[PDB]
Assembly symmetry: C3
Homo-oligomer: 390 residues x 3
């Protein structure tokens, strides 16, 4: 089940250490073996975001109450309410017709002020992932027939003592992929999505800072509140309905994600350096596969410019290296664009996930060699920050 | 033409691989050679940004039409137009004098509402560069007397098969320089610039999200529209002229960039690790140059704290290493601040580009050794996000 | 005083170079030694941010003057002032009661406009740290019984010539910790803090772009200015007091930082690669400490998810490696979360600083082995962008 480490991925020093490169991906696991010692496996078990900070909260369903109105006859100056100075209140000033029929000695315009109490009933939250929120669990196993290392952006290193191998340092970083500088965690009711940051910040709903407070205070309440036409002494204030449906539609296409409580689970990717004492490893070689591949399922698209391809091998020579190619609209082999580190069929009866990054526009993905090759045409659309909330 | 790889930039393992460090820069090319094998050259051919997402669009020239006005006599309540609920329309409410001369039984203030249709005629776009938008083409050549690798942030690796050398992995990353988290691609008409992000976001023009929509809807239309003084029954609405000229002036100093269609070409920089099978490379040594250097052209300034210096060598001992130094206002040699990886005169008749990062304030750049040295004084101003749009 | 380099942290090539990993932290210093050569020490001396760009300036104390009012009798149209078109002026329109007692032939509402000149008296500035603003001074010493390298994000490399060791390349990067994409430098009067970016951008004070200008022009002046109730011909305009006190309270908990002029000093952290010519280094081993540790001071908390622990060793076997562990609320050893690279007691009478990154929630920190161990319970609160400015 593990992919063996190739001799290009390590150096034994004449003196000093043996240094080893590995890439860990959800699912995959990597293995190597030293001069007469037990097998060594490494594997990424999970990737979690925990307790991310709120950027802003937004209101998708508001309620209105305590509607108060003050009005004054044309010769009686500007109307005033004390709730004008209350930030729980949303207020509006006008002038209305006044005259004999409503208590005034003159026909003319009278001042009017109306204030109502705004309450958010249903809100959503946009949350930022910082370095302190990301965590990876990496399990390292010596096959005397396991130790779970915790890796974080600020604590990328874990020194671990192994039977027979000795002290082994794991020095791991996240692979380049999802960018938490640009993507925000959006949580509405019970579901979550990854959305672009300015998309979120520019949403036209009442909003409040994520900052620490005792007194929740909304900005842009007007976006959900409608003051109806005023009468001499009274004016109705109304509220829009819930915008959960408008938000659901605007989020169409955004990646949904699974979060229990304050924890969100990702499909992580790590690049690691292993440092151990000077030691001669047994590098593992693989011949290019020679048989055919079928698509175990449809080519899936990520929201950050990649595609995931899962294939099944039909040939006889596993374990072997999967021949992979990308060609742009016009046949040019690209000699790159393969994201998966270890494109290896280690088990003929296990499907193999391959991630790759197609050119923009029309292109072709090719797995396998020769005429036996699976050829798939792909169209990749230019980048977008999301769909407009209406 | 290529700079040879020095023995400090590789290790051959006692076992495992040979690992090699190289830095690739536009222009330069690097070379090395193994125990009785053909020469090996690597070179970065181009760097492209393709199809970046729109953050916002901004309106620099608007037009107005369908101006409609409703007015009511003092005793006839609030004026209303259905276009008040139309987001293509920009509206304004007031009260105006009404009386016998314009159909009203009373002298007093009458309600008035005016709505006009806003259209953007000329817009600009600010676009964000994400990882999926960046691409590098690297050509690798074996001198039997070439293979073009594609490298991207998410797919930094390219395995390539070479004559005599075997399987060679290119593992490349962008060098630290331009920061696409901070700098935005601004496109107005046919020209483009790199501008700071908050500079852009805080521009005082009507704007609309880059988000996907069928119905273009502007925010802050007031910034280009002027409602003139209202009359009893009518009111003119006017629009500012084009702000292309104000934008051109505010962009003064911002780096202009070349973009055909959705592609923008950069002068890229890559740091690479080459991994190949255990092999003894022939490391190349260079003596410090001993002759003199002339400036083939004026010292050029970037907008991110560097300067580019291109020099010509006048001495006899090429290929050789160019002695370089930086001293702060008060003579302190800085032992650093040289950005160029391979400051090598490989060809006496080719000029050499050198990039360096001066201290802030007054300093000196020094190329060459001794009294034969070229000494240049430099002033570097503190950082700025740009000039104010007025 | 220096921590010796372990044999896991270097490789001597069979051919090519000797490559060495080191982590440099304020305080610590690292050392190694080659086959019959003088000792070699490296140490980070300082970390400075110099001349960061202004994002926005915000006004915390404003002043008002040149209050002008125009008013018109009910039958005399809309009031107007030329300062309405002056961006130094803040203006407000209404209608007021007019009648025989103030010069008008009719009782009714008359137009009124009031304009006052806004001036900021006390401002604050939020500043962004870019790559060109960060600098590290690294001193390298050969013990014949020192050369100061300058390292920056864009110029991470420094080639230095040493007695006996030869040419030595320092290739250094900042460790993952403070994130200048997210944290902004806030300067009010003479103090500075690190604050979150959106916290700052969403502050409710009058603001102006950091962009280059001759004419300082504020947005959202209303936030400090109060137009009092208008009279027939006059209206007072007033200004809030200074908000320095409200800002001081809202900044409660934000990290304060020391800045003289345009320079801000940090407690930096660097990860370095040393490249020198092929050479057999003397790797240094340390046994795990066996004695006890006391807390020389209280466990300190950073604002980015770490804690600093300084301990004193009471045992007899220095220099030795400090046994460190973290367990989550329920006893699980985490095999990671240690940030300090070289957790070494090199001197029994010097305290040792240890930085670590606890799980969120309840956990335990453990220094020392066995029953002699110091066991400390910790609670870590979820992330926050700061406290609400009220
Ligand atoms: C008005 O709302 C309720 C009546 O429904 C009353 O008890 C409450 O104290 C008032 N709230 C405010 C702030 O007006
Ligand atoms: C008004 O504008 C044109 C007349 O120029 C008319 O044909 C069009 O349908 C109207 N548009 C709106 C929305 O008022
Ligand atoms: C008004 O303010 C002062 C009087 O205090 C006067 O000298 C100045 O020129 C005027 N400024 C403006 C712009 O009104
Ligand atoms: Cl009436
Ligand atoms: Cl009239
Ligand atoms: Cl009166």
């Amino acid at each position: 089940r593990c992919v063996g480490i190739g001799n290009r991925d390590f150096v034994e020093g004449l003196s000093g250490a043996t240094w080893v490169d590995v890439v860990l991906e959800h699912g995959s696991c990597v293995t190597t073996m030293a001069k007469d010692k037990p097998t060594l496996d490494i594997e990424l078990l999970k990737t979690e975001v925990t307790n991310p900070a709120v950027l802003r909260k937004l209101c998708i369903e508001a309620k209105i109450s305590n509607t108060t109105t003050d009005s004054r006859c044309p010769t009686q100056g500007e109307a005033t309410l004390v709730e004008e100075q209350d930030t729980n209140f949303v207020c509006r000033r006008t002038f209305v017709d006044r005259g004999h029929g409503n208590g005034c000695g003159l026909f003319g315009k009278g001042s009017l002020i109306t204030c109502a109490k705004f309450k958010c009933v249903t809100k959503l939250e946009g949350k930022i992932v910082q370095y302190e929120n990301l965590k990876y669990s990496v399990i390292v196993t010596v096959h005397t027939g396991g130790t779970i290392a915790t890796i974080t952006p600020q604590a990328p290193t874990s020194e671990i003592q192994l039977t027979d191998y000795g002290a082994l340092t794991l020095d791991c970083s996240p692979r380049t992929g999802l960018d938490f500088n640009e993507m925000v965690l959006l949580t509405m009711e019970k579901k979550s999505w990854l959305v672009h940051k300015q998309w979120f910040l520019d949403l036209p709903l009442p909003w409040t800072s994520g900052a620490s407070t005792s007194q929740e205070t909304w900005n842009r309440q007007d976006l959900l509140v409608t003051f109806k036409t005023a009468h001499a002494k009274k004016q109705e204030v109304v509220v829009l309905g819930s915008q959960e449906g408008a938000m659901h539609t605007a989020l169409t296409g955004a990646t949904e994600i699974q979060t229990s409580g304050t924890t969100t689970i990702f499909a992580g990717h790590l690049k690691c350096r292993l440092k151990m004492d000077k030691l001669t490893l047994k590098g593992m070689s693989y011949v290019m596969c020679t048989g055919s591949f079928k698509l175990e399922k449809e080519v899936a698209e990520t929201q950050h410019g990649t595609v995931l391809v899962q294939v099944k091998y039909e040939g006889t020579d596993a374990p072997c290296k999967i021949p992979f190619s990308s060609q742009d609209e016009k046949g040019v082999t690209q000699n790159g664009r393969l994201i998966t580190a270890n494109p290896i069929v280690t088990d003929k009866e296990k499907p193999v996930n391959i991630e790759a990054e197609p050119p923009f526009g029309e292109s072709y993905i090719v797995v396998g060699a020769g005429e036996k090759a699976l050829k798939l045409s792909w169209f990749k659309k230019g980048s977008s920050i999301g769909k407009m909330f209406e």
